[PDB]
Design a protein around this motif. Structure first.
Motif, mmCIF file in Angstrom:
data_model
loop_
_atom_site.group_PDB
_atom_site.id
_atom_site.type_symbol
_atom_site.label_atom_id
_atom_site.label_comp_id
_atom_site.label_asym_id
_atom_site.label_seq_id
_atom_site.Cartn_x
_atom_site.Cartn_y
_atom_site.Cartn_z
ATOM 1 N N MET A 172 -1.690 4.897 -5.455
ATOM 2 C CA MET A 172 -0.985 6.172 -5.574
ATOM 3 C C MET A 172 -1.923 7.339 -5.869
ATOM 4 O O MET A 172 -1.602 8.474 -5.548
ATOM 5 N N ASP A 173 -3.074 7.054 -6.479
ATOM 6 C CA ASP A 173 -4.086 8.082 -6.738
ATOM 7 C C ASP A 173 -4.740 8.561 -5.437
ATOM 8 O O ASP A 173 -5.343 9.631 -5.398
ATOM 9 N N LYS A 174 -4.609 7.762 -4.378
ATOM 10 C CA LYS A 174 -5.175 8.096 -3.067
ATOM 11 C C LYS A 174 -4.195 8.881 -2.206
ATOM 12 O O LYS A 174 -4.540 9.327 -1.117
ATOM 13 N N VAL A 175 -2.967 9.040 -2.691
ATOM 14 C CA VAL A 175 -1.968 9.814 -1.962
ATOM 15 C C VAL A 175 -2.098 11.302 -2.315
ATOM 16 O O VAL A 175 -2.109 11.671 -3.493
ATOM 17 N N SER A 177 -1.084 2.937 -10.017
ATOM 18 C CA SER A 177 -2.485 3.189 -9.706
ATOM 19 C C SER A 177 -3.346 2.481 -10.754
ATOM 20 O O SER A 177 -3.153 2.670 -11.962
ATOM 21 N N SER A 178 -4.304 1.681 -10.299
ATOM 22 C CA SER A 178 -5.196 0.995 -11.228
ATOM 23 C C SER A 178 -6.311 1.938 -11.695
ATOM 24 O O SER A 178 -7.117 1.571 -12.547
ATOM 25 N N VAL A 179 -6.319 3.155 -11.146
ATOM 26 C CA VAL A 179 -7.293 4.191 -11.508
ATOM 27 C C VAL A 179 -6.742 5.175 -12.545
ATOM 28 O O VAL A 179 -7.410 5.473 -13.534
ATOM 29 N N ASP A 202 0.835 -1.192 0.000
ATOM 30 C CA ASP A 202 0.000 0.000 0.000
ATOM 31 C C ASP A 202 0.874 1.248 0.000
ATOM 32 O O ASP A 202 1.642 1.479 0.934
ATOM 33 N N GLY A 203 0.769 2.040 -1.061
ATOM 34 C CA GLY A 203 1.565 3.245 -1.182
ATOM 35 C C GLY A 203 1.171 4.354 -0.222
ATOM 36 O O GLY A 203 1.879 5.343 -0.101
ATOM 37 N N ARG A 204 0.051 4.187 0.474
ATOM 38 C CA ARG A 204 -0.481 5.240 1.348
ATOM 39 C C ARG A 204 0.155 5.256 2.733
ATOM 40 O O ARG A 204 0.036 6.235 3.470
ATOM 41 N N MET A 252 -1.339 15.129 -3.063
ATOM 42 C CA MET A 252 -0.235 15.828 -3.724
ATOM 43 C C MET A 252 0.952 16.105 -2.789
ATOM 44 O O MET A 252 2.109 15.843 -3.134
ATOM 45 N N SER A 253 0.651 16.640 -1.607
ATOM 46 C CA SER A 253 1.672 17.155 -0.695
ATOM 47 C C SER A 253 2.357 16.074 0.127
ATOM 48 O O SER A 253 3.302 16.350 0.862
ATOM 49 N N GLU A 254 1.877 14.843 0.019
ATOM 50 C CA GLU A 254 2.461 13.763 0.797
ATOM 51 C C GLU A 254 3.104 12.713 -0.101
ATOM 52 O O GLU A 254 3.679 11.745 0.388
ATOM 53 N N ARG A 255 3.015 12.905 -1.414
ATOM 54 C CA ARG A 255 3.551 11.916 -2.343
ATOM 55 C C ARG A 255 5.061 11.732 -2.134
ATOM 56 O O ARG A 255 5.560 10.608 -2.097
ATOM 57 N N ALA A 256 5.769 12.840 -1.965
ATOM 58 C CA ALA A 256 7.212 12.805 -1.749
ATOM 59 C C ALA A 256 7.602 12.052 -0.479
ATOM 60 O O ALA A 256 8.383 11.102 -0.531
#
Length: 172
Positions: free
Chosen positions: A122-125, A153-155, A92-94, A127-131
């Motif tokens: 990754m689409d659930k992450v 992301s499967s989305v 889970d990338g989150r 913008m500001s926390e992706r890094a």
């Protein structure tokens, strides 16, 4: 690459695996990691065996008491299926990697099983926390070795092209 997909075998024991063909990769991760949406996005449509193009397998492994059932199941596949080319480990990338994720990494290492880390959701992450979230994964896994990590992301479709290209290289 993917043209035909058929679930052809559900195996509860190693005597149940279909004959090795021209290639094989597998997929595993925690329950609710997004493994099913990933496979769907790839296909674009116990251990379950999907026949792809009539000559390869994509293997859907059980997500991780019933704990020992899951344990024996996966181990018999890893130790007995030498025609396995690559395991895709979905995490889970989150959130940061889970203790059980690092244990899979260690376990697969001792058996010399080739694996590729796949970050999902990754689409659930935000913008500001992706890094911050990205290096938590790269920093932790890199203490086990220098591994391929694919953000997916499967989305949105992120990483799908690369995952598909990796799988085509391996099998073709």
């Amino acid at each position: 690459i993917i043209r035909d997909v058929e679930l052809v075998k559900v195996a509860r024991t190693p005597g149940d695996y279909p004959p090795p063909l021209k290639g094989e990769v597998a997929f595993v991760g925690r329950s609710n990691v997004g493994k099913s949406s990933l496979l769907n996005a790839l296909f674009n449509r116990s251990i379950n065996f999907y026949l792809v193009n009539s000559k390869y397998y994509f293997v859907d492994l059980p997500g991780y008491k019933e704990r020992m059932l899951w344990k024996r199941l996966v181990e018999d596949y890893f130790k007995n299926r030498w025609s396995l080319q690559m395991v895709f480990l979905l995490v889970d990338g989150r959130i940061p990697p889970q203790d059980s994720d690092l244990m899979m990494v260690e376990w697969m290492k001792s058996l010399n099983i080739p694996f590729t880390i796949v970050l999902t959701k990754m689409d659930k992450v935000k913008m500001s926390e992706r890094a911050k979230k990205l290096e938590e994964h790269r920093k932790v896994f890199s203490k086990y070795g220098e591994y391929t990590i694919i953000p997916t992301s499967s989305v949105t479709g992120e990483g799908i092209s690369e995952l598909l290209d990796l799988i085509s290289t391996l099998l073709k």
